[PDB]
Structure formats: C-alpha cells, structure tokens
Amino acid sequence: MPLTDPAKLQIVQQRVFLKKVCRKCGALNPIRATKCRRCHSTNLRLKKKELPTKKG
Ligand SMILES: [Zn+2]
C-alpha cells in the first residue's frame, strides 16, 4: 500500500489473507483487529481471498 512500512505485524509481509472492511463504514481494519476502529460494531468482512487457478 501507499504507506509502505518495512514490515508490520500485518499481512503486508507476504500474506494471501487480505484485510477486513467494515460493512457499516467501509473501514478496513487489520486482520489483527477484532472489530471496526470506526463503529466498533464487530461488522467486518475480510476481502475476497480469491483462488489461484482452481479450487483447493
Ligand atoms: Zn464501522
């Protein structure tokens, strides 16, 4: 991301798991966060992990 840190304790350092975006605000929280840092409503959805080519 535009904020290019060296390596936080997040998925920035080569992870296939994306971040979670609040379905209320659209606030994307770290995979470490338990809930939204906007409304604290625990209403987050992790972005489409997607697939490589086939299922598995
Ligand atoms: Zn929210």
Amino acid at position 36, single letter: C
Closest CA to 2 of 16, 17, 12: 12
Q: How much distance in Å is there from the Cα of 35 to the middle of ligand 1?
A: 8
Q: How much distance in Å is there from the Cα of 50 to the middle of ligand 1?
A: 23
Say how many C-beta atoms besides its own lie within 10 A of residue 44's C-beta.
Answer: 21
**Which domains occur in the chain, in start order?**
1-56 (4.10.1060.50)
The structure was resolved experimentally with NMR
Gyration radius of the chain over CA positions: 13
- Which ranges constitute the DSSP H helices of the chain? none
Q: How much distance in Å is there from the Cα of 54 to the middle of ligand 1?
A: 33
For residue 20, give Cα distances in angstroms to 29, 36, 41, 47, 53: 5, 9, 13, 6, 23
Q: How much distance in Å is there from the Cα of 9 to the middle of ligand 1?
A: 22
